Short mmCIF file of C-alpha atoms and ligand atoms in Angstrom, two decimals:
data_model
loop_
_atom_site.label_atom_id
_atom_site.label_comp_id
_atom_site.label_asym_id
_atom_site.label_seq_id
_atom_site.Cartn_x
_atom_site.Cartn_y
_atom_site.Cartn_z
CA UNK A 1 -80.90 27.22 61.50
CA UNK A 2 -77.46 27.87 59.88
CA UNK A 3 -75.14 25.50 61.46
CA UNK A 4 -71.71 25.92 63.62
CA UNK A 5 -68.73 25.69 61.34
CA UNK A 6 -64.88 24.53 62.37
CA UNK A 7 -62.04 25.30 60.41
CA UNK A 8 -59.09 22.69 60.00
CA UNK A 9 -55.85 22.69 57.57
CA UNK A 10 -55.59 19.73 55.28
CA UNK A 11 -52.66 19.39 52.82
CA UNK A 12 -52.90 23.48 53.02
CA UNK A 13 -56.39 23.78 52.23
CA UNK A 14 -58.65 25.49 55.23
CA UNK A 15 -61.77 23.71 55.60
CA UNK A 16 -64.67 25.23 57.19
CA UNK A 17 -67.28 22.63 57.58
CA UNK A 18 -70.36 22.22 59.79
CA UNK A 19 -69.34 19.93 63.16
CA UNK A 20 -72.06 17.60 61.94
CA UNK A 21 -68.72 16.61 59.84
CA UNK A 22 -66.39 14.75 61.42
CA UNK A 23 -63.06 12.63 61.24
CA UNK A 24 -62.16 14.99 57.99
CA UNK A 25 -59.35 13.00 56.04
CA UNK A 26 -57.85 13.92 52.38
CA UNK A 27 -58.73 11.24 49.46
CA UNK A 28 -57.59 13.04 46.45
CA UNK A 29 -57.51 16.67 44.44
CA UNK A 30 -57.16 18.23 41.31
CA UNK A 31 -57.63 21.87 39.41
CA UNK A 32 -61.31 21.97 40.26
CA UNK A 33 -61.47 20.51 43.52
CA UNK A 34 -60.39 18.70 46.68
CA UNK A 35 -62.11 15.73 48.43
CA UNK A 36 -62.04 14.56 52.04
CA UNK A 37 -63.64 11.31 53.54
CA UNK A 38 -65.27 12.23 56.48
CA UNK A 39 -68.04 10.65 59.14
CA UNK A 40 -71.65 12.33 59.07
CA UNK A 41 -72.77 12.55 62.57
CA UNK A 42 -76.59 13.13 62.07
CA UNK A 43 -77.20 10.45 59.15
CA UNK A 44 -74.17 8.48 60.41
CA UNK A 45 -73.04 7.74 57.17
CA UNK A 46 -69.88 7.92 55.58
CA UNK A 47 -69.45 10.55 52.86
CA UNK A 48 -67.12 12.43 50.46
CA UNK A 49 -67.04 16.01 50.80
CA UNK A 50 -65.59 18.00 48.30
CA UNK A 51 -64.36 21.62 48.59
CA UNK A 52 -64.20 23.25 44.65
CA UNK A 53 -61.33 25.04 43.91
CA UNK A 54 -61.90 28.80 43.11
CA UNK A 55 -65.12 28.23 41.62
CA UNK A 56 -65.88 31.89 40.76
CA UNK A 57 -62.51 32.56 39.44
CA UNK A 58 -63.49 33.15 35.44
CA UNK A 59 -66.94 33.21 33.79
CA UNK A 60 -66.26 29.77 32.42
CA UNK A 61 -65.28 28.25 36.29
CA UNK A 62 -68.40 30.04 37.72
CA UNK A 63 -70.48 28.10 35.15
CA UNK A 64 -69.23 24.99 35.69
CA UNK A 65 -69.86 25.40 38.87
CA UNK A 66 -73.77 26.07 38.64
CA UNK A 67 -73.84 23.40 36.25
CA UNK A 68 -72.43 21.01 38.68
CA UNK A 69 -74.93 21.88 41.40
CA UNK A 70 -77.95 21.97 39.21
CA UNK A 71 -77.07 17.84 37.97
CA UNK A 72 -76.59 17.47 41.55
CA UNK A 73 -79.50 18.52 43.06
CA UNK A 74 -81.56 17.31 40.18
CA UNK A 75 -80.18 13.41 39.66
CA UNK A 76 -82.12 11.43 42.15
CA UNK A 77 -81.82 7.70 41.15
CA UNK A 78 -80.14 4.18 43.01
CA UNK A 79 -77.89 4.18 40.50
CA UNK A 80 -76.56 7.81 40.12
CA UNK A 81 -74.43 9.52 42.77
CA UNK A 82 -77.22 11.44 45.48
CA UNK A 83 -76.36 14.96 47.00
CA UNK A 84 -76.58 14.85 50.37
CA UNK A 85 -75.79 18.23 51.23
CA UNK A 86 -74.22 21.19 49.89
CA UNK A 87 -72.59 24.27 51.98
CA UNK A 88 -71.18 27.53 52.38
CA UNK A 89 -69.56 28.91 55.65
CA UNK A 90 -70.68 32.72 54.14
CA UNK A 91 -73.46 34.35 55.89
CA UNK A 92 -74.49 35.96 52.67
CA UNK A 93 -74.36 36.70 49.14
CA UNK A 94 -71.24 39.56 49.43
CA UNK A 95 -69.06 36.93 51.49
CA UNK A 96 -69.91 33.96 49.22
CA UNK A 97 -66.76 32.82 48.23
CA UNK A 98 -66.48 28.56 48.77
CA UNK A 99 -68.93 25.64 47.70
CA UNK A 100 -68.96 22.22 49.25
CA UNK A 101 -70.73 19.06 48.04
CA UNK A 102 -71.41 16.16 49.96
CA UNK A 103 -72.11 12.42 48.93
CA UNK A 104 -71.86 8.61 49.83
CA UNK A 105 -68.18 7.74 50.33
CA UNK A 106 -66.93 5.61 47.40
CA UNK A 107 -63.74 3.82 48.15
CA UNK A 108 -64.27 0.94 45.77
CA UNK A 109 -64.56 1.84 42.13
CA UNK A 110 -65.20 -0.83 39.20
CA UNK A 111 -61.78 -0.39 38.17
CA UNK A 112 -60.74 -2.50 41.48
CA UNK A 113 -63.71 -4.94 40.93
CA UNK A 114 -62.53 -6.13 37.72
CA UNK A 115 -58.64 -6.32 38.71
CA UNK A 116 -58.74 -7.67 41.77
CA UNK A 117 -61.69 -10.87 41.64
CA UNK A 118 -63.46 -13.09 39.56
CA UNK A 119 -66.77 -12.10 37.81
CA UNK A 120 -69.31 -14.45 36.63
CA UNK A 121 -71.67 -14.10 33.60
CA UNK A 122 -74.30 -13.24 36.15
CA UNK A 123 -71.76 -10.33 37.90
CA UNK A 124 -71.51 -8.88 34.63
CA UNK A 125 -75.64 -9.29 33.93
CA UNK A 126 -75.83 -7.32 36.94
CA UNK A 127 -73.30 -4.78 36.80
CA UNK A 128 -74.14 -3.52 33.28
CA UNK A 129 -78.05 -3.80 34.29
CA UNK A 130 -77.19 -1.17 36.60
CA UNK A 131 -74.99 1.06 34.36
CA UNK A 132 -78.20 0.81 31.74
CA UNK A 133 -80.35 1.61 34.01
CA UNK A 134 -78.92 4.76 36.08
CA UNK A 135 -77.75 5.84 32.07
CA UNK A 136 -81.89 5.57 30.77
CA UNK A 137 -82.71 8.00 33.61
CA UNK A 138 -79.87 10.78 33.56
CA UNK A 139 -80.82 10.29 29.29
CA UNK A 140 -84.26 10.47 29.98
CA UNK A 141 -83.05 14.65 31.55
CA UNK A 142 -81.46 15.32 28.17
CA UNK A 143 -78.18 14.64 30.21
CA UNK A 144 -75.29 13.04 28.75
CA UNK A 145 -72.50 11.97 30.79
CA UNK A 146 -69.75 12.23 28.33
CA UNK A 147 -66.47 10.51 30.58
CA UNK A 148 -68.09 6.87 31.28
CA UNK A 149 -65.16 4.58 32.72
CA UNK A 150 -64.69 1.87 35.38
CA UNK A 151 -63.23 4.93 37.59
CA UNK A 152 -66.59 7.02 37.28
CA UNK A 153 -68.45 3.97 38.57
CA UNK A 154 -68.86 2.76 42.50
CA UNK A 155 -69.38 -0.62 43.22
CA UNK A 156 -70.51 -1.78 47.46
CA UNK A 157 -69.56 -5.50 48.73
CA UNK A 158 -73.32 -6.37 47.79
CA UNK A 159 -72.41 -5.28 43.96
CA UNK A 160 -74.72 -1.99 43.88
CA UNK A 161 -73.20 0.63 41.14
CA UNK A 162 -73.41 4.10 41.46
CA UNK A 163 -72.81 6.19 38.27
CA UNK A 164 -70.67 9.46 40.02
CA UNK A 165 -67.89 11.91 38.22
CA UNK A 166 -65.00 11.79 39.92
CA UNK A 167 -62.97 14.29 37.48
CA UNK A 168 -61.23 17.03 39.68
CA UNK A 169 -59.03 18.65 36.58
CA UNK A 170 -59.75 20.01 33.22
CA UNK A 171 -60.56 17.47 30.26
CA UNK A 172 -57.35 18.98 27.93
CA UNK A 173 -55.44 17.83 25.43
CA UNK A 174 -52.54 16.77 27.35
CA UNK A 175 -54.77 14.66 29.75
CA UNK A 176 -55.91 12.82 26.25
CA UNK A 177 -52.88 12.49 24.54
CA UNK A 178 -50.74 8.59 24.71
CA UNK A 179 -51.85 5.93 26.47
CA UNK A 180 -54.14 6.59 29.16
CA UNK A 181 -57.63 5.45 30.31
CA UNK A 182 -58.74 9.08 29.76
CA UNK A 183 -59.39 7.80 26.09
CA UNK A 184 -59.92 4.03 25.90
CA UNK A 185 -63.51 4.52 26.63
CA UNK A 186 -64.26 6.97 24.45
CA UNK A 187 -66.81 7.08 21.43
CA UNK A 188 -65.05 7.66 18.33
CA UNK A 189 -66.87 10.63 16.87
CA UNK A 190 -65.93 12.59 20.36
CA UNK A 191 -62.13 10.92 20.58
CA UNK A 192 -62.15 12.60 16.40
CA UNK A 193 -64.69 15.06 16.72
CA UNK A 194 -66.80 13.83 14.03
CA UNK A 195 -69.99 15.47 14.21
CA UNK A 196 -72.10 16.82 16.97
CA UNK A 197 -72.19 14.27 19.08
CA UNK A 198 -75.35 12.42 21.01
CA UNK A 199 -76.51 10.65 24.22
CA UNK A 200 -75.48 7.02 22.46
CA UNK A 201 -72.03 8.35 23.18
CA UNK A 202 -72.17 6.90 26.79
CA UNK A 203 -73.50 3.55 25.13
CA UNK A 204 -70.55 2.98 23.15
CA UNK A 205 -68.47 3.87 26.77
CA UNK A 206 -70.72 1.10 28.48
CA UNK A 207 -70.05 -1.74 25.37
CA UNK A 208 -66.10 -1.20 26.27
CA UNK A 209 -66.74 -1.53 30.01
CA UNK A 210 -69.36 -4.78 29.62
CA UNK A 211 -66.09 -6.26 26.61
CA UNK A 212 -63.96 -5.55 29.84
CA UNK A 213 -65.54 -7.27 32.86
CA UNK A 214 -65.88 -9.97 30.11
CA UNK A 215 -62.33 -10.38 29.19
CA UNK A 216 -60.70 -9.02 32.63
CA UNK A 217 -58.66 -6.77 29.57
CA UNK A 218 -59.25 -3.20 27.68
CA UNK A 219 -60.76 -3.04 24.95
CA UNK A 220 -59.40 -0.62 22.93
CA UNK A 221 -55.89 0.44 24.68
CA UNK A 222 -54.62 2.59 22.14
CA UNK A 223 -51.13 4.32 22.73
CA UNK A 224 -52.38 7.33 20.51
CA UNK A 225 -55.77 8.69 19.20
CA UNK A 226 -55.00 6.62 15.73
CA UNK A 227 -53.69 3.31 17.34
CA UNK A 228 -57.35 3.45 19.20
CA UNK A 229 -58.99 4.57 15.84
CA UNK A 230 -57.37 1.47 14.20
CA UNK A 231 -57.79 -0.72 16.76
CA UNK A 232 -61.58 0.27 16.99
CA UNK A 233 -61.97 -0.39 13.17
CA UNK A 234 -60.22 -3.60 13.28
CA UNK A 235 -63.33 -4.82 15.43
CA UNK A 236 -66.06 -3.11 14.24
CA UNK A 237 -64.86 -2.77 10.47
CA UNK A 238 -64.26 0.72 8.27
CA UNK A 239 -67.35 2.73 7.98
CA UNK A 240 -69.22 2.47 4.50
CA UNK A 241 -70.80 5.44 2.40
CA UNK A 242 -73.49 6.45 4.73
CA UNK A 243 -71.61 6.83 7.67
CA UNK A 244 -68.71 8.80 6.01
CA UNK A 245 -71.40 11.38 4.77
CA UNK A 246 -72.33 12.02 8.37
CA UNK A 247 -69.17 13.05 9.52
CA UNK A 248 -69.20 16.70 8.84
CA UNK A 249 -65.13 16.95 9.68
CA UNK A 250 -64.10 17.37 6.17
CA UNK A 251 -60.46 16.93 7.46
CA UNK A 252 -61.68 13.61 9.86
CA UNK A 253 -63.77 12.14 6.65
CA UNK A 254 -60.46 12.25 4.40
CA UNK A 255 -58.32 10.61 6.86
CA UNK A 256 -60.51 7.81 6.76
CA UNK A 257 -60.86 6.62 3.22
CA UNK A 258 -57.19 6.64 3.66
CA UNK A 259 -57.20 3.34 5.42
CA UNK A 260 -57.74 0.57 3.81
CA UNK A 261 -61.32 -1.50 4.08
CA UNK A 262 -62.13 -4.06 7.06
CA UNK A 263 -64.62 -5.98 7.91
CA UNK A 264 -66.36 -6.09 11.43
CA UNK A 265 -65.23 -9.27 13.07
CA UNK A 266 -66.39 -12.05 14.53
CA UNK A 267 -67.53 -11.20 17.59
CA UNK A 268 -67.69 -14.73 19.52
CA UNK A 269 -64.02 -15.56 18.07
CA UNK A 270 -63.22 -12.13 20.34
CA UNK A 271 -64.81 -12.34 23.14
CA UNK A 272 -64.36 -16.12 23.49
CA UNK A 273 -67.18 -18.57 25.69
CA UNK A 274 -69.51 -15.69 26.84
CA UNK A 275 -72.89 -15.77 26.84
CA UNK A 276 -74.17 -15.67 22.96
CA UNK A 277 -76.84 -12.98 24.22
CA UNK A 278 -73.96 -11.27 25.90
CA UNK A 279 -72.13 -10.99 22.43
CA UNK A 280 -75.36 -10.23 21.00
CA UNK A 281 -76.06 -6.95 23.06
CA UNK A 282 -71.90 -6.03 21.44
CA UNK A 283 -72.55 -6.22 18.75
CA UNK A 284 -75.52 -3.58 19.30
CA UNK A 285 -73.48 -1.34 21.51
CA UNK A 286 -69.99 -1.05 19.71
CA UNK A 287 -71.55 -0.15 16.31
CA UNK A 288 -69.84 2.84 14.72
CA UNK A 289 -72.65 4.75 13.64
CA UNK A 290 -74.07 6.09 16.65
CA UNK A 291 -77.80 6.92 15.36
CA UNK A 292 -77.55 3.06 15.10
CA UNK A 293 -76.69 2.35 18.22
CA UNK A 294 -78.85 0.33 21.33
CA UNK A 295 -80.02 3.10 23.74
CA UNK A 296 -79.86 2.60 27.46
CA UNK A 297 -84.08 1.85 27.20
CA UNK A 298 -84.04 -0.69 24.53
CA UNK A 299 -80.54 -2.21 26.18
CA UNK A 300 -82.91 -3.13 29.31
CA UNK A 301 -85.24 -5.06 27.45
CA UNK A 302 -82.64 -6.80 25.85
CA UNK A 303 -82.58 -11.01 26.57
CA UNK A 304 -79.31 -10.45 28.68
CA UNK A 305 -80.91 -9.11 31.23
CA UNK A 306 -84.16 -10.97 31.14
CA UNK A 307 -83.14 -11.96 34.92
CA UNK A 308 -83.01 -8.47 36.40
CA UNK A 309 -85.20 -6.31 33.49
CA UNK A 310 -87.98 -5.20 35.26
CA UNK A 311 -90.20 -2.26 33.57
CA UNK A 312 -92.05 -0.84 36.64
CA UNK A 313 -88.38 -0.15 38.53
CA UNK A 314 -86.63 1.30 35.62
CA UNK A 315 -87.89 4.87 36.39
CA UNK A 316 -87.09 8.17 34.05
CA UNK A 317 -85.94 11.74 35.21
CA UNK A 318 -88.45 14.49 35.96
CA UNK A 319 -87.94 17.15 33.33
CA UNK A 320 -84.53 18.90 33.72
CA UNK A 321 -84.26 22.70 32.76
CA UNK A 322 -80.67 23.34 30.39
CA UNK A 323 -81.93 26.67 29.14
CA UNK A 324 -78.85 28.18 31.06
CA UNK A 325 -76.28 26.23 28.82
CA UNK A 326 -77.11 29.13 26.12
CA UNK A 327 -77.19 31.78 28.55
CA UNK A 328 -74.09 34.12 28.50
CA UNK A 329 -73.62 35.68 32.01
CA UNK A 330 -70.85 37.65 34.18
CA UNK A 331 -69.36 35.93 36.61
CA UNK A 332 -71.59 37.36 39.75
CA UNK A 333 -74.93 36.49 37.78
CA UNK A 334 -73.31 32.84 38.00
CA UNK A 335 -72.50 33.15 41.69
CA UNK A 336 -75.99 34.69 42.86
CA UNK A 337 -77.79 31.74 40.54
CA UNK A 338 -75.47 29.02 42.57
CA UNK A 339 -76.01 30.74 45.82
CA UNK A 340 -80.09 30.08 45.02
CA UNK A 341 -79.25 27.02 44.65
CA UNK A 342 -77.58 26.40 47.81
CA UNK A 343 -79.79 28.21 50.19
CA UNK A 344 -82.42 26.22 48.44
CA UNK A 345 -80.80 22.83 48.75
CA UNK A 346 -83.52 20.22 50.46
CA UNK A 347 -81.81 16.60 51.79
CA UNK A 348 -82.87 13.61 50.87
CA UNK A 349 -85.04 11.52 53.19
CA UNK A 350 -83.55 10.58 56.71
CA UNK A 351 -81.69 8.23 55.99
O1 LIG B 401 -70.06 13.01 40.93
C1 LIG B 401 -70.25 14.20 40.69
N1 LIG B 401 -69.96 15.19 41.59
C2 LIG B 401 -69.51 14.96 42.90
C3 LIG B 401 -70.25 15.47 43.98
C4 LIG B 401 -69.88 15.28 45.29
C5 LIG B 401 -68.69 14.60 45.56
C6 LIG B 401 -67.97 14.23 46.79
C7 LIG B 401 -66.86 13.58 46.37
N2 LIG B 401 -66.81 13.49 44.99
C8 LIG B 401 -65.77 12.84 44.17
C9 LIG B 401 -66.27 11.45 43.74
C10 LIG B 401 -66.47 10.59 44.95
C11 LIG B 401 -67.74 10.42 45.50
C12 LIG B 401 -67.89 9.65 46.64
N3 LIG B 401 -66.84 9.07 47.21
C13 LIG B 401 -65.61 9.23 46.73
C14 LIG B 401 -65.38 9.99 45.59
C15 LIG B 401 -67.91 14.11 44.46
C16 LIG B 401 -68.32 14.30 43.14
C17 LIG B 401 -70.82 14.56 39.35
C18 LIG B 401 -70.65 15.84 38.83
C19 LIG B 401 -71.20 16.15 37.60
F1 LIG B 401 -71.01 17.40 37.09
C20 LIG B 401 -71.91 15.18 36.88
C21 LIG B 401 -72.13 13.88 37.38
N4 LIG B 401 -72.82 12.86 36.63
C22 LIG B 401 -73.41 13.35 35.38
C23 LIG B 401 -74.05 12.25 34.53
O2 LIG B 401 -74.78 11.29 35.28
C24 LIG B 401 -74.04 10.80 36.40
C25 LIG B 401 -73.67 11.93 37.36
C26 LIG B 401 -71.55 13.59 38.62
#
């Protein structure tokens, strides 16, 4: 059953892949990873392979690495990046040393949607329909995607989205420091750390995307951390007494009352001649409070989308399992849990 594997040097990385893979070529890489494209012989589709980088290294890499696998194998939605196969070239447990993951090639991200042509009201009905609706189901598994941006987001000719992650390197503080989409997208109360943060987190991600494809512009491009906090607040206004009281950052809360009091804005003197119902759904989304905040369910049942909503396709996740997020491990009780995983790996339906 196990298959024939070739090895092959790329940008001095040895892959060792089944020969079902073909036509291997380098897209991109990072700390935790390298990606080729590559052609599929047996589905004959085109697919993104990624090799992780040491992924049994430390405690914390092995982790993240079972994590990974377990979101994987579990998120099974048209509108969240499918697994379609994961491999090791190691004949068993005391060899296993490398993890591969393969999806649907990307290429074109959202990112190069919204720069490079024009998008009607009805392009943007239909792109954030999409976002919504993959976002209900991986919130319906008690998962919470954390990095939402235009870069995380794959968009075909016929203008089907895929939520994926496309993050290959550590989330540090360098990587969030100045001004760099690595923040612009970001709800506040993770940007600060306010509080312990929720799944309306990735709604407040999806408001700046939707304010984007609107405007063709960023939302909030802040050079700095502050310049984004202040340019947030200028929008949404300063929060009042109740809000303040559930920011449990003593040192985040002070800096705060510091600045002086704004209204939130008019939204349709922002986000000038879009659809009313468009502004509407804003205002719902960017709203600093997060227990406040639309969720992904009540979003799809929102006017806006009265041309695409339909309840009986806007499925839910089957119950996901996180009881290993509290689990402290060593780093071969990691490895043997992922290598269950991958000898247990079933594709998806042919084709
Ligand atoms: O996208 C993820 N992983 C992944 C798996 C396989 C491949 C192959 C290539 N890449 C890089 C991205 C890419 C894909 C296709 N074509 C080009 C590039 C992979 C990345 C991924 C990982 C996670 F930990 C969470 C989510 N989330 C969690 C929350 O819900 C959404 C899924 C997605």
């Amino acid at each position: 059953e196990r298959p024939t594997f070739y090895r092959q040097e790329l940008n001095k990385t040895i892959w060792e892949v089944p020969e079902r893979y073909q036509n291997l070529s380098p897209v991109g890489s990072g700390a935790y990873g390298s990606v080729c494209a590559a052609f599929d012989t047996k589905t004959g589709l085109r697919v993104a392979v990624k090799k992780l980088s040491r992924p049994f290294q430390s405690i914390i890499h092995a982790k993240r690495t079972y994590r990974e696998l377990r979101l994987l194998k579990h998120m099974k939605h048209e509108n969240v990046i499918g697994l379609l196969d994961v491999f090791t070239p190691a004949r068993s447990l005391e060899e296993f040393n490398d993890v591969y993951l393969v999806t649907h090639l990307m290429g074109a991200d959202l990112n190069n949607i919204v720069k490079c042509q024009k998008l009607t009201d009805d392009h943007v009905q239909f792109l954030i329909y999409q976002i919504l609706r993959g976002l209900k189901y991986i919130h319906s598994a008690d998962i919470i995607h954390r990095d939402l941006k235009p870069s995380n987001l794959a968009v075909n000719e016929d203008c089907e989205l895929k939520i994926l992650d496309f993050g290959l390197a550590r989330h540090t503080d360098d990587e969030m420091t100045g001004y760099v989409a690595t923040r612009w997208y970001r709800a506040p109360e993770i940007m600060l750390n306010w509080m312990h943060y929720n799944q309306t987190v990735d709604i407040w991600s999806v408001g700046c995307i939707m304010a984007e494809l609107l405007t063709g512009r960023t939302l909030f491009p802040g050079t700095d951390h502050i310049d984004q906090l202040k340019l947030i607040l200028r929008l949404v206004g300063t929060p009042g007494a109740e809000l303040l009281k559930k920011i449990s950052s003593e040192s985040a809360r002070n800096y705060i009352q510091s600045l002086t009091q704004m209204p939130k804005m008019n939204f349709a003197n922002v986000f000038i001649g879009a659809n009313p119902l468009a502004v509407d759904l804003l205002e719902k989304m960017l709203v600093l409070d997060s227990d406040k905040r639309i969720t992904a369910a009540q979003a799809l049942a929102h006017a806006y989308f009265a041309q695409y909503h339909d309840p009986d396709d806007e499925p839910v996740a089957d119950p996901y399992d996180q009881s290993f997020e509290s689990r402290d491990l060593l780093i071969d009780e990691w490895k043997s849990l992922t290598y269950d995983e991958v000898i247990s790996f079933v594709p998806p339906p042919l084709d």
